[PDB]
Q: What sequence folds into this?
């Protein structure tokens, strides 16, 4: 009934911002407790609480973790009152392949165009996908990325309006991956016309 | 013990003309007895014979599925089908499924081909964006020489709702040089109840 | 001519019972009590159709203790009083329809209220701890069960914006045999 | 008074009748009326043609007239419920049926058990009342015994309506447990 | 070169109970029928016609099963000629919600005598497939006596057509009742709805 | 393809245009400025204004070839109709029948309180041939209670080159 998940830091937050966070998610007052397997101190975590439209209550705790602490292999635990653990992914690494496409205009969509990005063949599954226009990152809510499925690959989708591509007809799909070289960034550009 | 009940795939419903629903029982720990999967219709009208299937998983968990043929007119005109799971366990489990309601919108199909990737010049990936369809049920096949490729050859994402109403899926197909040099045409075809005239929309993509 | 009893809602919840004399054809509706004790002022409404109605406030204690009120129309004579006999509290059952094709933002809630005696019954629907307007629902007039009780059905169309705000709707029957505050209720949720 | 055929007589029995309740019968098209059955309140029941009624034939009794209701059509939605066990009544259960959003208002409701139609007096159905939008609704109530549901725990509420498809019937089953 | 594949008329499907579909090629062409289910297909009737504009018209009329069509079967027509690639046309039962047609019939006033015009508005039906017949003295008039507009989508979801029937005074003096009748899969219960109209 | 000016533009507006559709140069020839507008197949349209008198004089324009069609003339007959109140009292469908006009070029408008309603308010069929001489068109207009309470009169108007006196024929219909 009451599910619990614990995610790893975003690759964009972990390698670029150097501000990694892990998130413990509880899906139906429950209490969440952070703890480290080493015993070292956990930082103060932010806790959020939101009632969903299906009557579900969702509790999310976001814990800041040390960048070196995460890469050194620390194991963090989330205790709900069921306990979850998260640690870095081991295993082989591989850079991602990025391809960006632009749809032709649908018979109706004369002033809106859809951009798609395929990122595939990367290891492990942890990846961040971003869309940029004029070197400024777009709001995350404007694009929708699938979770990685084993061949790992993700698809990203971004609808752009006529005002944007007429301002500049160039949109960058950027993948931030642990195995991406040389700046943990592999990106592609695409144009509407 | 968890139980799920699917709807017919648009392919089975509109192309194969053999729609089926599947009651999937995932038993976190197999016990001793034989779980009972009983089919019924909310109208009280008869159901057909179902196929039962049991398979123990590598995590020591038992999986029991029952597949029921449903009448094409019956399903389309809004019949509700019911899977009753008697296991042991405390109370009986009851799942039901019916056609999804709401506005209808045909899918838009866009088929792309990734340019050649260094380190593998015999592989090309084909991507298909299918979007702006309502409701969410959709089937995707990839055709070569007007013949349908096996389903395991392609992956399709689960439908997601767009900015407005409407859904989208991506379909990915890895092809080989032997296949595109034999003929450089590949059909991404989407099967959806709202497509006209025969519930299919398709687009041709070429590797070059 | 018809002469109704106070609704259990007005009598027990609002604590302001009234009775209504309806004549289906000026006329003279002289209100009186069988005891000869005074009656209050009444309202009067005459409506030409393609009928004269008059509503009299009555005392709560006066009604509960068995006073008989009379509507003489001039000659038509109708009287009303507290029904007497066996009392039985109402059974309350509330149901939600499943989602019907072509309208996923609408659900109908149904309430069966049965096996109560006497037949005087009121039904309220509550959502978000507060009473929905009476016009939101319809309720059948009491019909005799197979045994000696009565039953009504109450129907309430609800919207997705309401059950996503709070997925709980209460069907509340007001009846004199309900212990101890003259109400029985049952909650129904859409999912 | 002059009634229209019940949807059960019209579409299930296929012998529809109209009754003039207080007598000569006539059709607006001038065609003859069948043999009338007079019964002494005095009523006259006239058999009508099924195709004739559906085609909008106007029958008159004397003067009162009747014809099938015009306007839009809509199939009924059916939902069947069973009440939980009530304390002190372990061997009784009440079944309820909500039939709604149909147009026009003429509708026939039956309850079946083992595909055997229970007698009319076993149940009570309200008269059609208007919904909040367009369309009508009725409620049907059926008390059932322990012996009935222990023999087969399935009861069918069936609605007969002109606009229902394919055979002018929509039904729902309900079980006690 | 273009090809068209029609659905059965509601009249053939529901009144005649002999539904057929037509494959119409316009400019020696070959036409092949099949079913998406793979089930066999009956024998087709082939007809060619020379037109005034010098273009040939080849038609293939295929009888289809009544229960097969109603169950949602898909039928296919394939055309081949000297054209680059084969033309594929497919047809099946129309989907979506169903609504019976609403029929209303008008009689026009006399224009500034020997002839009067009757109009029939049939609207708010789904899907778009509809047949319109005119009756007089309980017998159907020849189809050539009237003309029916092609279905156009109304403001809501439904469709409408108009049907126009010229009548002579010798006809309404014999009897002054003319029946406009729509055949439609959603009409109940016998797939027909009708309205009578008089000149006076 | 090459289209002729609509009777509305020719008579009501007095600024006729022709459109060349390619699924491009204009010639008469005597002496106007052109306007161009851009399934997988691109469709291009170019709209050229023409002099009113010139098209009346029988001038032949080319992109194929178009000109004022010669032939017999016949004015349109107009009948306006209102459906009965449906069992939806805030909406009424209005119908109009235009018939027996030659040639087939015709324009149909609905007017309310002397203002032409937007074209998308009504749905008008293509000119179909009748049994005798002339064509016919049907026009359908859904109206609302707010419209007829302000003025319960709706004009169905046909613009046709053979209509007299001023190329218009109209009939008024009321809801109540
Ligand atoms: C009532 O409604 C509520 C909704 O209001 C619903 O609650 C949902 O419940 C489901 C299931 O219980 C939840 O789904 C789970 O969510 C887990 C957390 O998801 C977050 O984290 C994901 C992991 O992030 C890491 O990995 C990614 C990928 O590399 C990386 O980018 C990150 O930086 C990080 O490293 C993340 O992928 C995910 O983001 C995707 O999805 C969200 C949509 O939720 C979207 O906004 C994003 O843009 C992106 O597309 C998200 O940020 C998740 O880990 C978990 O996934 C595992 O399990 C599923 C099986 O369920 C597997 O299929 C999957 O492959 C993974 O193994 C799972 O998906 C969901 O989060 C709840 N929603 C909310 C808002 O709380 C209730 O269930 C409803 N009740 C009922 C009865 O139905
Ligand atoms: C031991 O190992 C076995 C084998 O993997 C695991 O069994 C799996 O359990 C999961 C979770 O119970 C099952 O996932 C569910 O599958 C349902 C069926 O989906 C199939 O069919 C549909 C259409 O017919 C396809 O689209 C799909 O790809 C599958 O082929 C889904 O309907 C379920 O989704 C619904 O429920 C979930 C949970 O609430 C929601 O998140 C979804 O959004 C949706 O509402 C669900 O995905 C899986 O099918 C099982 N596989 C097998 C082979 O049995 C055991 O779980 C595992 N044991 C342990 C303890 O880990
Ligand atoms: C030389 O002259 C001949 C004789 O007229 C022409 O043949 C016609 O060609 C046109 C196409 O150019 C055909 O038009 C199409 O007809 C299809 C068949 O319709 C049947 O069913 C309808 C009822 O729904 C009947 O009214 C009709 O008579 C037929 O029985 C229609 O399905 C088509 O309409 C739909 O599709 C098109 C798609 O482009 C849309 O534009 C339409 O609006 C509509 O959505 C279409 O109308 C016509 O049927 C042919 N008639 C005959 C007798 O053969 C030649 O075209 C002509 N050649 C040249 C070069 O001019």
A:
């Amino acid at each position: 009934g009451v599910s619990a998940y614990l995610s790893r830091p975003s690759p964009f937050d972990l390698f670029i911002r150097k501000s990694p966070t892990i998130t413990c998610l509880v899906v139906d007052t429950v209490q969440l407790t952070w703890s480290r397997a080493s015993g070292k101190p956990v930082q103060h975590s932010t806790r959020k609480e939101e009632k969903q439209r299906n009557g579900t209550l969702t509790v999310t705790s976001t814990l800041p973790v040390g960048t070196r602490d995460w890469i050194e292999g620390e194991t963090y635990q989330c205790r709900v009152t069921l306990m979850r653990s998260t640690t870095k992914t081991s295993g082989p690494r591989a850079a991602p392949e990025v391809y960006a496409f632009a749809t032709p205009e649908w018979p109706g969509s004369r002033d809106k165009r859809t951009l798609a990005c395929l990122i595939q063949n990367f290891m492990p599954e942890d990846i961040s996908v971003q869309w940029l226009h004029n070197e400024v990152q777009l709001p995350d809510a404007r694009h929708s990325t699938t979770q990685p499925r084993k061949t790992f690959f993700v698809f990203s989708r971004l609808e752009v309006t006529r005002a944007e591509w007429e301002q500049k007809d160039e949109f960058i799909c950027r993948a931030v991956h642990e195995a991406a070289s040389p700046s943990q960034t592999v990106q592609r550009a695409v144009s509407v016309n």
Residues 62 and 171 of chain B are 31 Å apart (CA to CA). The pocket of ligand 2 is lined by residues B 2, 4, 6, 22, 24, 26, 28, 57, 59, 61, 63 (CB under 6 Å). The two ends of chain B are 51 Å apart (CA to CA).
